[PDB]
Coordinates of C-alpha atoms and ligand atoms in Angstrom, one line a residue:
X298 CA 12.7 4.1 -29.7
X299 CA 12.4 7.8 -29.0
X300 CA 10.1 9.1 -26.3
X301 CA 6.5 10.3 -26.7
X302 CA 5.4 13.5 -25.0
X303 CA 1.7 12.9 -24.5
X304 CA 2.8 11.7 -21.0
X305 CA 5.5 13.1 -18.8
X306 CA 7.6 10.6 -16.8
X307 CA 7.5 10.9 -13.0
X308 CA 9.7 8.5 -10.9
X309 CA 8.5 8.0 -7.4
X310 CA 11.4 8.6 -5.0
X311 CA 12.7 5.6 -3.1
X312 CA 15.1 6.1 -0.2
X313 CA 17.7 3.4 0.4
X314 CA 20.8 3.5 2.5
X315 CA 24.5 3.1 1.9
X316 CA 26.2 1.7 5.0
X317 CA 29.8 1.7 6.2
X318 CA 29.7 -0.2 9.5
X319 CA 26.9 -1.5 11.7
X320 CA 24.4 0.8 13.4
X321 CA 25.5 3.5 11.0
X322 CA 25.0 4.1 7.3
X323 CA 23.9 6.8 5.0
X324 CA 20.5 7.3 3.3
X325 CA 20.3 7.7 -0.5
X326 CA 17.7 10.0 -2.1
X327 CA 16.8 7.8 -4.9
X328 CA 13.8 7.4 -7.3
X329 CA 12.2 4.5 -9.1
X330 CA 11.3 3.6 -12.7
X331 CA 9.0 1.1 -14.3
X332 CA 10.3 -1.3 -16.9
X333 CA 9.6 0.0 -20.5
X334 CA 7.3 -2.9 -21.4
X335 CA 4.4 -1.4 -19.6
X336 CA 4.4 2.0 -21.4
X337 CA 2.6 3.1 -24.5
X338 CA 4.1 3.0 -28.0
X339 CA 2.8 5.2 -30.8
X340 CA 3.7 7.5 -33.7
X341 CA 3.4 11.2 -34.3
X342 CA -0.3 11.2 -35.3
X343 CA -1.1 9.1 -32.2
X344 CA -2.0 5.4 -32.2
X345 CA -0.4 2.3 -31.1
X346 CA 2.7 0.8 -32.6
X347 CA 1.7 -2.1 -30.5
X348 CA -1.9 -2.7 -29.2
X349 CA -2.6 -5.7 -27.0
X350 CA -0.3 -8.7 -27.8
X351 CA 0.1 -7.6 -31.4
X352 CA 2.1 -4.9 -33.2
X353 CA 0.4 -2.5 -35.5
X354 CA 0.4 -1.7 -39.2
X355 CA 2.0 1.6 -38.3
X356 CA 5.2 -0.6 -37.7
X357 CA 7.1 -2.7 -40.2
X358 CA 10.6 -3.6 -39.0
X359 CA 13.2 -3.6 -36.3
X360 CA 14.8 -0.4 -37.5
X361 CA 11.9 1.7 -38.8
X362 CA 10.0 0.9 -35.6
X363 CA 12.6 2.8 -33.5
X364 CA 12.8 5.9 -35.8
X365 CA 9.0 6.0 -36.1
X366 CA 7.6 5.1 -32.7
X367 CA 8.3 6.4 -29.2
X368 CA 7.5 5.5 -25.5
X369 CA 5.6 7.4 -23.0
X370 CA 5.6 8.5 -19.3
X371 CA 3.6 6.1 -17.1
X372 CA 0.6 8.3 -16.2
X373 CA -0.2 7.9 -12.5
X374 CA 1.9 5.0 -11.3
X375 CA -0.7 4.3 -8.5
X376 CA -4.0 4.1 -10.5
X377 CA -2.7 2.6 -13.7
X378 CA -0.1 0.1 -12.3
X379 CA -0.5 -0.3 -8.5
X380 CA 2.8 1.5 -8.2
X381 CA 3.3 3.3 -4.9
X382 CA 6.3 4.4 -2.9
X383 CA 6.2 6.0 0.6
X384 CA 9.5 7.3 1.7
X385 CA 11.4 4.0 1.9
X386 CA 8.6 1.6 1.1
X387 CA 7.8 0.7 -2.6
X388 CA 4.5 -1.1 -2.6
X389 CA 3.6 -3.0 -5.8
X390 CA 0.1 -4.2 -6.5
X391 CA -0.7 -7.5 -8.3
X392 CA -4.1 -7.0 -9.7
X393 CA -5.2 -3.4 -10.5
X394 CA -8.4 -2.3 -12.2
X395 CA -9.0 0.9 -14.1
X396 CA -11.5 2.6 -16.5
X397 CA -10.3 0.9 -19.7
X398 CA -7.5 -1.6 -19.1
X399 CA -6.0 -4.1 -16.6
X400 CA -2.3 -3.9 -15.6
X401 CA -0.9 -7.2 -14.5
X402 CA 2.3 -7.3 -12.4
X403 CA 5.2 -4.9 -13.0
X404 CA 9.0 -4.3 -12.7
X405 CA 10.8 -1.5 -11.0
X406 CA 14.5 -0.4 -11.1
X407 CA 16.2 1.7 -8.5
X408 CA 17.6 4.8 -10.1
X409 CA 20.3 7.4 -9.8
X410 CA 18.9 10.6 -11.3
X411 CA 16.2 10.5 -13.9
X412 CA 18.8 9.5 -16.6
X413 CA 20.6 6.6 -15.0
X414 CA 19.6 3.6 -12.9
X415 CA 22.0 3.0 -10.0
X416 CA 24.8 0.5 -10.5
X417 CA 25.8 -1.9 -7.8
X418 CA 29.1 -3.4 -6.7
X419 CA 28.0 -6.7 -5.1
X420 CA 31.2 -8.9 -4.8
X421 CA 32.4 -8.4 -1.2
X422 CA 29.5 -6.4 0.1
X423 CA 25.9 -7.4 1.0
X424 CA 22.4 -6.4 0.4
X425 CA 19.5 -6.3 2.8
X426 CA 15.8 -5.3 2.8
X427 CA 12.6 -5.5 4.8
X428 CA 9.8 -7.4 2.9
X429 CA 6.1 -7.9 3.6
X430 CA 4.9 -10.6 1.3
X431 CA 2.3 -11.9 3.8
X432 CA -0.5 -11.7 1.1
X433 CA 1.6 -13.0 -1.7
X434 CA -0.2 -16.3 -2.5
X435 CA 0.6 -19.4 -4.5
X436 CA 1.6 -18.6 -8.1
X437 CA 2.8 -15.1 -7.7
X438 CA 6.5 -14.1 -7.7
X439 CA 7.4 -11.1 -5.6
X440 CA 10.9 -10.7 -6.8
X441 CA 14.0 -8.7 -5.8
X442 CA 17.2 -9.2 -7.8
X443 CA 20.2 -7.8 -9.7
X444 CA 20.5 -8.0 -13.5
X445 CA 23.5 -6.3 -15.2
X446 CA 21.6 -3.9 -17.4
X447 CA 23.5 -0.8 -18.8
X448 CA 24.1 2.3 -16.8
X449 CA 22.4 4.9 -19.0
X450 CA 19.8 2.4 -20.4
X451 CA 21.9 1.2 -23.3
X452 CA 21.5 4.6 -24.9
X453 CA 25.1 4.9 -25.9
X454 CA 25.4 1.2 -26.8
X455 CA 22.3 1.4 -29.0
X456 CA 21.4 5.0 -29.7
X457 CA 18.2 4.0 -31.7
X458 CA 16.9 4.4 -28.2
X459 CA 17.0 8.0 -27.0
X460 CA 14.7 7.2 -24.1
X461 CA 17.3 5.4 -22.1
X462 CA 17.1 4.6 -18.3
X463 CA 14.9 7.7 -18.2
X464 CA 12.1 5.5 -19.3
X465 CA 12.9 2.0 -18.1
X466 CA 14.4 0.8 -21.4
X467 CA 17.2 -1.9 -21.4
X468 CA 16.0 -4.8 -19.1
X469 CA 18.1 -8.0 -19.4
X470 CA 18.5 -11.0 -17.2
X471 CA 19.9 -14.6 -17.7
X472 CA 16.9 -15.9 -19.7
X473 CA 17.3 -13.4 -22.5
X474 CA 14.3 -11.0 -22.2
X475 CA 12.7 -12.1 -25.5
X476 CA 9.3 -10.5 -24.4
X477 CA 10.6 -6.9 -24.5
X478 CA 9.3 -4.9 -27.4
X479 CA 12.8 -3.4 -28.0
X480 CA 16.3 -4.8 -27.4
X481 CA 19.4 -2.9 -28.2
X482 CA 17.2 -0.1 -29.5
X483 CA 15.6 -2.3 -32.3
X484 CA 12.0 -3.4 -32.3
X485 CA 11.4 -7.1 -31.9
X486 CA 8.4 -6.8 -34.3
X487 CA 9.6 -8.9 -37.2
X488 CA 8.2 -12.4 -36.6
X489 CA 6.7 -11.2 -33.3
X490 CA 4.3 -14.0 -32.3
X491 CA 1.6 -13.3 -29.8
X492 CA 1.1 -15.1 -26.5
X493 CA -1.4 -17.9 -26.1
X494 CA -2.8 -16.9 -22.7
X495 CA -1.3 -13.4 -22.0
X496 CA -3.4 -10.7 -23.7
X497 CA -0.5 -8.3 -23.1
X498 CA 2.4 -10.5 -24.1
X499 CA 4.3 -11.9 -27.1
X500 CA 7.7 -13.4 -27.7
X501 CA 10.2 -11.6 -29.9
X502 CA 13.1 -12.7 -32.1
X503 CA 15.9 -11.0 -30.1
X504 CA 16.2 -11.3 -26.4
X505 CA 18.2 -9.1 -24.0
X506 CA 20.9 -11.2 -22.3
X507 CA 23.3 -10.7 -19.5
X508 CA 23.9 -12.0 -15.9
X509 CA 21.2 -12.3 -13.2
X510 CA 21.5 -12.7 -9.4
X511 CA 18.1 -13.6 -7.9
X512 CA 18.6 -12.6 -4.3
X513 CA 14.8 -13.1 -3.8
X514 CA 12.3 -14.9 -6.0
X515 CA 9.2 -15.7 -3.8
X516 CA 5.9 -15.3 -2.1
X517 CA 4.7 -16.3 1.4
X518 CA 5.0 -20.1 0.9
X519 CA 8.6 -20.5 -0.3
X520 CA 11.6 -18.4 -1.3
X521 CA 14.6 -19.1 -3.5
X522 CA 18.1 -17.6 -3.7
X523 CA 19.4 -18.1 -7.3
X524 CA 22.4 -16.6 -9.0
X525 CA 22.9 -17.3 -12.7
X526 CA 26.1 -16.8 -14.7
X527 CA 27.0 -16.2 -18.4
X528 CA 29.9 -16.8 -20.8
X529 CA 29.6 -13.1 -20.9
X530 CA 27.7 -11.6 -18.0
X531 CA 27.4 -8.1 -19.4
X532 CA 24.5 -6.9 -21.5
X533 CA 24.3 -8.8 -24.8
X534 CA 22.0 -9.8 -27.6
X535 CA 21.1 -13.3 -28.7
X536 CA 19.6 -14.1 -32.2
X537 CA 16.8 -16.6 -32.5
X538 CA 18.8 -19.8 -32.7
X539 CA 21.3 -18.3 -30.2
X540 CA 18.5 -17.6 -27.8
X541 CA 17.6 -19.9 -24.8
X542 CA 15.3 -19.3 -21.8
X543 CA 11.5 -19.9 -21.3
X544 CA 10.9 -18.0 -24.5
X545 CA 13.0 -20.1 -26.9
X546 CA 12.6 -23.9 -27.6
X547 CA 16.1 -24.5 -26.3
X548 CA 16.2 -23.4 -22.7
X549 CA 20.0 -23.9 -22.4
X550 CA 20.5 -22.3 -25.8
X551 CA 22.9 -19.2 -25.8
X552 CA 25.6 -18.0 -23.4
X553 CA 23.7 -18.0 -20.1
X554 CA 22.4 -20.0 -17.2
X555 CA 18.6 -19.8 -17.0
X556 CA 18.3 -22.2 -14.1
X557 CA 21.4 -21.1 -12.2
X558 CA 22.2 -22.5 -8.8
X559 CA 19.3 -22.1 -6.4
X560 CA 18.8 -22.5 -2.7
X561 CA 15.2 -22.9 -1.8
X562 CA 15.1 -24.3 1.8
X563 CA 12.1 -26.4 1.0
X564 CA 13.7 -27.8 -2.1
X565 CA 16.8 -28.6 0.0
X566 CA 14.7 -30.7 2.3
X567 CA 13.3 -28.3 5.0
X568 CA 9.5 -28.0 4.8
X569 CA 8.6 -26.3 8.0
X570 CA 11.2 -23.5 7.9
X571 CA 9.5 -20.9 5.8
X572 CA 5.9 -19.7 5.7
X573 CA 2.9 -18.7 7.7
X574 CA 3.6 -20.0 11.2
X575 CA 7.0 -21.4 10.3
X576 CA 10.3 -20.5 12.0
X577 CA 10.6 -17.7 9.5
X578 CA 7.0 -16.5 9.8
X579 CA 6.0 -15.1 6.4
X580 CA 2.7 -13.9 7.8
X581 CA 4.6 -11.0 9.2
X582 CA 7.3 -8.7 7.7
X583 CA 11.1 -9.4 7.9
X584 CA 14.7 -8.7 7.0
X585 CA 16.8 -10.6 4.5
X586 CA 20.5 -9.7 4.5
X587 CA 22.5 -11.3 1.7
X588 CA 26.2 -11.5 0.9
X589 CA 28.5 -11.9 -2.1
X590 CA 32.0 -13.5 -1.8
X591 CA 34.0 -15.4 -4.4
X592 CA 32.8 -19.0 -4.1
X593 CA 30.3 -17.8 -1.4
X594 CA 26.9 -16.1 -1.3
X595 CA 25.3 -15.9 2.2
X596 CA 21.7 -15.0 3.1
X597 CA 20.3 -14.8 6.7
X598 CA 17.1 -13.4 8.1
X599 CA 16.2 -11.1 11.0
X600 CA 12.6 -11.7 12.3
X601 CA 11.5 -9.8 15.4
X602 CA 15.1 -8.8 15.9
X603 CA 16.3 -12.4 16.0
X604 CA 18.8 -13.7 13.5
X605 CA 17.3 -16.6 11.6
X606 CA 19.7 -19.0 9.8
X607 CA 18.4 -20.9 6.9
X608 CA 18.7 -24.7 7.5
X609 CA 21.4 -26.7 5.7
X610 CA 20.0 -29.2 3.2
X611 CA 18.8 -32.7 3.9
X612 CA 19.3 -35.2 1.1
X613 CA 22.4 -37.5 1.1
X614 CA 25.4 -36.4 -0.9
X615 CA 24.7 -32.7 -0.6
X616 CA 26.9 -30.1 1.1
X617 CA 26.7 -29.8 4.9
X618 CA 25.8 -26.1 4.6
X619 CA 23.2 -23.6 3.3
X620 CA 25.7 -21.3 1.6
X621 CA 25.9 -21.0 -2.2
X622 CA 29.4 -22.4 -2.8
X623 CA 30.7 -24.4 -5.8
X624 CA 30.5 -27.6 -3.7
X625 CA 26.7 -27.1 -3.6
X626 CA 26.4 -26.3 -7.3
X627 CA 28.4 -29.4 -8.0
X628 CA 26.7 -31.9 -5.7
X629 CA 23.3 -30.4 -6.1
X630 CA 23.2 -32.1 -9.5
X631 CA 24.5 -35.5 -8.5
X632 CA 21.1 -36.2 -7.0
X633 CA 18.7 -33.4 -8.0
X634 CA 18.1 -35.1 -11.3
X635 CA 18.6 -31.9 -13.4
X636 CA 20.7 -30.6 -16.3
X637 CA 23.9 -28.9 -15.0
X638 CA 24.0 -25.6 -16.9
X639 CA 26.1 -24.1 -14.1
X640 CA 29.2 -26.1 -15.0
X641 CA 28.5 -25.6 -18.7
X642 CA 28.6 -21.9 -18.8
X643 CA 31.6 -21.5 -16.5
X644 CA 30.8 -23.1 -13.1
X645 CA 31.2 -20.9 -10.0
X646 CA 34.2 -19.3 -11.2
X647 CA 32.2 -17.7 -14.1
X648 CA 29.7 -16.6 -11.5
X649 CA 32.4 -15.0 -9.5
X650 CA 33.4 -13.1 -12.6
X651 CA 29.8 -12.1 -12.7
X652 CA 29.9 -11.0 -9.1
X653 CA 32.2 -8.2 -10.2
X654 CA 29.9 -6.9 -12.9
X655 CA 28.0 -3.6 -12.4
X656 CA 24.4 -4.4 -11.5
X657 CA 21.0 -2.9 -11.0
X658 CA 18.4 -3.7 -8.4
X659 CA 15.0 -4.8 -9.7
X660 CA 12.0 -5.2 -7.5
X661 CA 8.9 -7.0 -8.9
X662 CA 5.7 -8.9 -8.8
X663 CA 4.3 -11.1 -11.6
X664 CA 2.6 -14.4 -12.6
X665 CA 4.2 -16.7 -15.1
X666 CA 2.3 -18.0 -18.2
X667 CA 4.6 -20.8 -19.1
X668 CA 4.6 -22.7 -15.7
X669 CA 2.3 -21.0 -13.2
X670 CA 5.2 -20.5 -10.7
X671 CA 5.3 -24.3 -10.5
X672 CA 9.1 -24.3 -10.2
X673 CA 9.0 -22.0 -7.2
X674 CA 6.1 -22.9 -5.0
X675 CA 5.7 -26.7 -5.4
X676 CA 6.5 -29.9 -7.1
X677 CA 7.7 -29.2 -10.7
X678 CA 7.9 -30.4 -13.3
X679 CA 4.7 -32.1 -12.3
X680 CA 5.7 -35.3 -14.1
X681 CA 5.8 -38.0 -11.5
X682 CA 6.9 -36.0 -8.3
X683 CA 8.3 -37.7 -5.2
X684 CA 11.8 -37.2 -6.5
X685 CA 14.6 -34.9 -5.1
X686 CA 14.3 -31.4 -6.5
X687 CA 10.7 -31.6 -7.8
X688 CA 9.0 -30.5 -4.5
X689 CA 9.9 -26.8 -4.1
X690 CA 7.0 -25.5 -2.0
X691 CA 3.7 -26.2 -0.2
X692 CA 1.4 -25.1 -3.1
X693 CA -0.8 -27.7 -4.8
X694 CA 0.2 -28.0 -8.5
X695 CA -3.2 -26.6 -9.4
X696 CA -2.3 -23.1 -8.6
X697 CA -0.4 -20.3 -10.4
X698 CA -2.9 -20.4 -13.3
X699 CA -2.7 -16.8 -14.6
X700 CA -6.3 -16.0 -15.0
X701 CA -7.2 -17.9 -11.9
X702 CA -4.8 -16.6 -9.3
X703 CA -5.5 -13.2 -10.8
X704 CA -9.1 -13.7 -9.7
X705 CA -8.7 -15.5 -6.3
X706 CA -6.8 -12.8 -4.3
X707 CA -6.3 -9.8 -6.6
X708 CA -5.4 -7.5 -3.7
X709 CA -2.1 -9.4 -3.4
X710 CA 0.8 -7.0 -2.9
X711 CA 4.5 -7.1 -2.3
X712 CA 6.0 -4.3 0.0
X713 CA 9.6 -3.5 -0.6
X714 CA 11.5 -1.2 1.7
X715 CA 14.3 -0.3 4.1
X716 CA 17.1 -1.2 1.7
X717 CA 20.6 -1.4 3.1
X718 CA 23.8 -1.6 1.1
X719 CA 27.5 -1.8 2.1
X720 CA 30.5 -4.0 3.1
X721 CA 29.8 -7.4 4.6
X722 CA 28.1 -6.8 8.0
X723 CA 27.4 -3.1 7.8
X724 CA 23.7 -3.1 7.2
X725 CA 23.0 -5.0 10.5
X726 CA 25.0 -6.7 13.2
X727 CA 24.1 -10.4 13.2
Ligands
LIG103 O1 -0.6 0.6 -22.4 C1 0.1 -0.7 -22.7 C2 -0.4 -1.7 -21.6 O2 0.8 -2.1 -20.9 C3 0.3 -3.1 -19.9 O3 1.5 -3.7 -19.3 C4 1.6 -5.0 -19.7 C5 2.7 -5.1 -20.8 O4 2.0 -4.9 -22.1 C6 3.6 -6.3 -20.9 O5 4.8 -6.0 -21.6 C7 3.9 -6.9 -19.5 O6 4.6 -8.1 -19.6 C8 4.9 -8.7 -18.4 C9 3.9 -9.7 -18.0 O7 2.7 -9.1 -17.4 C10 4.4 -10.7 -16.9 O8 3.5 -11.9 -16.9 C11 5.8 -11.2 -17.2 O9 6.2 -12.0 -16.1 O10 6.7 -10.1 -17.4 C12 6.3 -9.4 -18.6 C13 7.3 -8.4 -19.1 O11 6.9 -7.9 -20.3 O12 2.6 -7.1 -18.9 C14 2.1 -5.8 -18.5 C15 1.0 -6.0 -17.5 O13 -0.2 -5.2 -17.9 C16 -0.5 -2.3 -18.9 O14 -0.7 -3.0 -17.7 C17 -1.8 -1.8 -19.5 O15 -2.6 -1.0 -18.6 C18 -1.5 -1.1 -20.8 O16 -2.7 -1.1 -21.6
LIG104 O1 13.4 -13.4 -11.4 C1 13.9 -13.1 -12.6 C2 13.8 -14.2 -13.7 O2 13.2 -15.4 -13.1 C3 13.3 -16.4 -14.0 O3 12.7 -17.6 -13.4 C4 13.6 -18.8 -13.6 C5 14.3 -19.1 -12.3 O4 15.3 -18.1 -12.1 C6 14.9 -20.5 -12.3 O5 15.2 -20.8 -10.9 C7 14.0 -21.6 -12.8 O6 14.6 -22.8 -12.9 C8 13.7 -23.9 -13.2 C9 13.7 -24.2 -14.7 O7 12.9 -23.2 -15.3 C10 13.1 -25.6 -15.1 O8 13.5 -26.0 -16.4 C11 13.4 -26.7 -14.1 O9 12.5 -27.8 -14.3 O10 13.2 -26.2 -12.7 C12 14.2 -25.2 -12.6 C13 14.5 -25.0 -11.1 O11 14.5 -26.3 -10.5 O12 13.6 -21.1 -14.1 C14 12.7 -20.0 -14.0 C15 12.1 -19.8 -15.4 O13 11.3 -20.9 -15.6 C16 12.4 -16.1 -15.3 O14 12.5 -17.1 -16.2 C17 12.9 -14.8 -15.9 O15 12.2 -14.4 -17.1 C18 12.9 -13.7 -14.8 O16 13.4 -12.5 -15.4

């Protein structure tokens, strides 16, 4: 899909820092871009190629939708989407009201120049960030993660898209982004079915698949550290039958891990470790440094200067430790009562061969129509409960309801900042 010129594209700048050794790094004058699903699509004589949850008569097929339509700069990222950067801090607003619309959650990808998002060599180094989710309530996911999208935006891989990373095209994770309106520069209009609760969404035929490492899926009641690996980690397209994820009737259908191997302290048997008032106090802002080693992913916090280690798990027959190692991913499933995709798609070796694939840093805040963040902040699937693995937070299973938590605390915000990247133990000294 080409680009439309009714709106110029202006990426807020977001400073991060490249480290070499402790108490010494190097800043990074970066910028930021919003995922391409939030912009406007039209044709030459102006009018939507996609209005609301449905496509338009203007469009007819995967191909002629890319040679006919185009995407647009985001207008003012602040007033239209709650987007707002301040030096090193990227604020993101959950519920934003404007003249004639209503943006709901968004996605942002660290850049390198207005043409390229910034690629990331994880395996052997670590990533850290300050985060203030203190008003991110039950049902919202204020997210920070890596998903191997392409460098330029997939523009050379699929030149039907001449917008490229320039306009947030190209998003892919490990659930096959079936919701995107374009994947591999083709429009997902053919057979596009509209959402049943999301007035802005729909699920497409093609999804955008690749690997995903979920350093931080959360809000102030619980967090989760979840990598996910694929039979091919790199960007890649699934086709209807060969699509799994939330968006296809067969979750584990395709080449990827949609569940991956999480570590949620609460889920692992420690209730009182993370929240408002807990050891890790989420009422206040903190530091989450996280590491990448073959067969090991470590993640520690810094609150009020102090190092805070996450508690090892509790239940019998689980590893002694908190680290995401293949002993975990193995054992996790001998008692957590869940389908082991992890071993299916390659086990922790395949993830390590995923830890070496070029990645890009997404920061985000969203609510989830298919499960109301049930899987993150409480007991899910809320079909019995009282088993190992179901309780995953301190939220009642009433919450997360899209419309509802959109009305209860619509000032909710995540605040992303003070990013640090480099070899293991460079970003801090704990
Ligand atoms: O001008 C076009 C409209 O874009 C709106 O953005 C919505 C997008 O249409 C939609 O693709 C995006 O989908 C999100 C979804 O909100 C979220 O629940 C899910 O977790 O991720 C999806 C990824 O596609 O929703 C946004 C939210 O609005 C603008 O907000 C709107 O002003 C504008 O009319
Ligand atoms: O943040 C990026 C992506 O998040 C995805 O959320 C998935 C989580 O990564 C995963 O931990 C969770 O696993 C659930 C599984 O859905 C469910 O079948 C089972 O009962 O509980 C598992 C954990 O115990 O899956 C969610 C999706 O439901 C988004 O799916 C993805 O679109 C987004 O980019």
